[PDB]
Amino acid sequence: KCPLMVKVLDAVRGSPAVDVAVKVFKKTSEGSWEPFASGKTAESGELHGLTTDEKFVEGVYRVELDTKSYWKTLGISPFHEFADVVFTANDSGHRHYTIAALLSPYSYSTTAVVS
């Protein structure tokens, strides 16, 4: 039943990325980003329960991982200010989305699983 999940891994430690701050924004008709949902990754590196099928309507979404604070907490000065993932959701029926991310200090990878 979870329509939008986030999963984050740490490529330096070979572990889930724990305590990663996540902010979701939804684009408005006027074109601005308004706050939609927020949370933190658990011990699993996964974030559940951001939203529900009812609230997760058609629109353009931006998922922002606070990668800078993550690396700095571990004593590492990273390259990026954050990692944004921007996408259109539910444009042709309701789907379930997973945004996965793999983090290094100077690099990240992100994949979408859509079902």
- 71 is written with which tokens? 């690396």
85 lines the binding site for its own copies (CB under 8 A): yes
Using alpha carbons, select from 38, 45, 79 the residue that is nearest to residue 62: 38
Sign of CA pseudo-dihedral 77, 41, 22, 103: positive
Could you tell me the smallest distance in angstroms from the CB atom of residue 88 to its own copies?
A: 7
| Options 18-26, 29-37, 50-58, 82-90: segment touching its own copies (CB under 8 A) | 82-90
- Nearer residue to its own copies within complex by CB, 51 or 110: 110
| Options 18-26, 28-36, 46-54, 101-109: segment touching its own copies (CB under 8 A) | 101-109
Q: Give the three-class secondary structure for 68.
A: helix
**What are the two backbone dihedrals, phi and then psi, of residue 81, each rounded to the nearest 5 degrees?**
-70, -35
Distance CA 72, CA 16 (A): 16
Map tokens 């309507």 to a residue: 57
14 lines the binding site for its own copies (CB under 8 A): yes
63 lines the binding site for its own copies (CB under 8 A): no
The site for its own copies (CB under 8 A) is made up of: 9-16, 60, 79-82, 84-88, 100, 102, 104-115
